[PDB]
Amino acid sequence: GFLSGFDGRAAVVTGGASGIGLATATEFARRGARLVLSDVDQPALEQAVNGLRGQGFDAHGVVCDVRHLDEMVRLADEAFRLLGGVDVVFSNAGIVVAGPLAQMNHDDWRWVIDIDLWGSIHAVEAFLPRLLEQGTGGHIAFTASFAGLVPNAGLGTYGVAKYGVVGLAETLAREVKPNGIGVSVLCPMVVETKLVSNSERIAFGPLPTQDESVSADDVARLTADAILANRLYILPHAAARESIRRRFERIDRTFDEQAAEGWTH
Amino acid sequence: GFLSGFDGRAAVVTGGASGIGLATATEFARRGARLVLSDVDQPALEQAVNGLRGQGFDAHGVVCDVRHLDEMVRLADEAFRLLGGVDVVFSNAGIVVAGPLAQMNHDDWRWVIDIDLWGSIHAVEAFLPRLLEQGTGGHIAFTASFAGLVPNAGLGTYGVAKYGVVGLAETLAREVKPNGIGVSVLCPMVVETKLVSNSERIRSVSADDVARLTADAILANRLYILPHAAARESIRRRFERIDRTFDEQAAEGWTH
């Protein structure tokens, strides 16, 4: 049941009115997919949908805030009605938000866990049983972050949510492989913009932002390719590799440090 | 200053009435720390405090449901009042749910996320500002799980929460190192405790062995605490799956 192509297939993209969501949906449509996009903003969603129709594609918009399970259930119902089935679900919400852990208040935490973690959990709650009942395989993809794979100072709160999304994707991949449902997680790079000499001429710690050195269109092509190849990870920036290695080496060496002090298990 | 020894230090342990939390509290106390144990099971908490006091240890019980930030704030206030200060916080309370992701209802998700992930977040929210204000460093340890480091079919929902705990610990370690606050995250495979029965009700390596390793790791200021060597290969396998993605992308012509 693993996705063999996008042509004539049905895809649902949350947060589809802009950014990664819209770029990815547009790539799916270029490859022949029929689209349902969701976003919180009715008129901006209408605009994205009309843009896609203007390019000759078939797209509908459904208003949905991913933080609310009931709205996600309504979206799943509407997507199956409009498309007659769903083959690909691309769960996407939110943007990079930074700040030192010590300065995050409770509202900061609540917002980020809701949009960046619950928005992805809700996509599984609302779509997974329906994809299993449909019984024809398909694919579920998530937008996490490089900050879902390694610690980044200044992205503590966003990182906690994104670690949860990566864990969700990795376990889901194993569980639904036997059902012919592929799983991928897109992990976009972040960067601390260092103060340039020109800006310097003109206390919160590092404040990373999204890396914009690779275009959204290129990343959308990689994302669609990864889904077709059924690759679990989508890692657009080569700079990520060494940080991931360093994290796993720190974990691994811990075993030898323990043994050196006399641990026997 | 990073923790130099437990003698005369003040420690707070959540989920301290049973299992790894009680064992670790007991180990801290054997090493001379003064303790605040916290839990939701009130008779168990009182019994656990009695057990420590009977051994001549200075221990107090404070009830706290870690799902509620106001309760965790009350715990932090009361621990500072009872002990004069807090040097070590062990955010350990947790529950388990098991089963395929597709079998989880919304209540399963809420219970696990609220106790296992929000309990940890709330411990930082409540204790971190107080530790920074106190200005003498300290240590914050979390109980995550081996499921916070690798996927496990049947432990998806638990794993989502425990991944969030590991991410919290790893970033927090970097941010508060300049303040002399050490951070550790404990990631065991299976340990015989009352976890399963307590989890249902709320809705090999012994716990004492884990407690010795945890106390030792805190004094060594090690970020990871990994009692089961069987975890090592699975962690390596996960790294390899991630790392090879770069070569697979390049083979397809990706140049970024």
- The domains of chain A, with CATH numbers, are 1-265 (3.40.50.720)
- DSSP reduced 3-state for A56: coil
* Chain A residue nearest residue B147, CA to CA: A167
User: CA B97, CA A107: separation in Å to the nearest integer?
Assistant: 27
- DSSP reduced 3-state for A90: strand
Of A164, A171, A241, the CB nearest to B164: A164
For residues B34 and B62, the answer to whether their CB atoms sit within 8 Å is no
Contact A265 B109 (CB under 8 A): no
For residues B219 and B117, the answer to whether their CB atoms sit within 8 Å is no
User: H or E element: which one contains B229?
Assistant: none
For residues B146 and B190, the answer to whether their CB atoms sit within 8 Å is no
- Nearest Cα residue to A88 out of A16, A39, A148: A16
End-to-end Cα, chain A, rounded Å = 42
- DSSP reduced 3-state for B91: strand
For residues A112 and A156, the answer to whether their CB atoms sit within 8 Å is no
- DSSP reduced 3-state for B174: helix
Q: Tokens standing for B8?
A: 């005369």
User: CA B170, CA B129: separation in Å to the nearest integer?
Assistant: 18
* Chain B residue nearest residue A252, CA to CA: B232
- Nearest Cα residue to A169 out of A238, A226, A101: A226
Residue A90 to residues A93, A182, B6, B159, Cα–Cα distance (Å) = 10, 12, 50, 21
- At position B22, the amino acid (one-letter code) is L
User: CA B40, CA B38: separation in Å to the nearest integer?
Assistant: 7
Distance (Å) from the alpha carbon of B218 to chain A's nearest alpha carbon: 12
- Nearest Cα residue to A118 out of A154, A70, A61, A83: A70
For residues A160 and B167, the answer to whether their CB atoms sit within 8 Å is yes
Of A162, A168, A171, the CB nearest to B153: A171
Of B167, B223, B256, the CB nearest to A159: B167
For residues B111 and B159, the answer to whether their CB atoms sit within 8 Å is no
Q: Does residue B161 sit at the A interface (CB-CB below 8 Å)?
A: yes
Half-sphere exposure of B38 (CA within 13 A, CB side): 29
- Residue B232 burial (CB count, 10 A): 15
User: CA B186, CA B146: separation in Å to the nearest integer?
Assistant: 8
For residues B13 and B90, the answer to whether their CB atoms sit within 8 Å is yes
Task: Strand A34-39: give its sheet, edge to edge.
Answer: A59-63, A34-39, A10-13, A88-91, A138-143, A181-186, A233-234
User: CA A63, CA A75: separation in Å to the nearest integer?
Assistant: 8
Return residues 113-132 of A near B (CB < 8 Å). 113, 117-118, 121, 124-125, 128-129, 132
User: CA B252, CA A230: separation in Å to the nearest integer?
Assistant: 13
> What is the experimental method?
X-ray
* Chain A residue nearest residue B128, CA to CA: A102
Question: Token match 């390793």: residue?
Answer: B213
For residues A152 and A195, the answer to whether their CB atoms sit within 8 Å is no
Q: Is A139 exposed, middle or buried (0-12, 13-18, 19+ CB in 10 A)?
A: buried
User: CA A32, CA A223: separation in Å to the nearest integer?
Assistant: 15
Q: Tokens standing for A252?
A: 């691994």
For residues B103 and B148, the answer to whether their CB atoms sit within 8 Å is no
For residues B239 and A244, the answer to whether their CB atoms sit within 8 Å is yes
User: CA A25, CA A51: separation in Å to the nearest integer?
Assistant: 12
User: CA A74, CA A93: separation in Å to the nearest integer?
Assistant: 17
C-alpha B254 chain-centroid distance: 40
Contact B222 A257 (CB under 8 A): yes
- DSSP reduced 3-state for B88: strand
